[PDB]
Amino acid sequence: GRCYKSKPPICFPD
Strand-pair partners of 14: none
Peptide bond into 8 cis (omega under 30): yes
Question: For the CA atoms of 12, 1, 5, 10, what is the dihedral angle to 10 degrees?
Answer: 10
DSSP-derived secondary structure for 1-14: -EEE-SSS-EEE--
Per the entry, the structure determination technique was NMR
Distance CA 14, CA 4 (A): 12
Residues 6+ apart with CB under 8 A from 7: none
Cβ atoms of 2 and 12 closer than 8 Å:
yes
Those residues whose C-beta lies under 8 Å from the C-beta of residue 8, and which sit 6 or more positions away, are none
Q: How far is CA 9 from the centre of its chain?
A: 5
Q: Is the separation of the CB atoms in 4 and 12 below 8 Å?
A: no
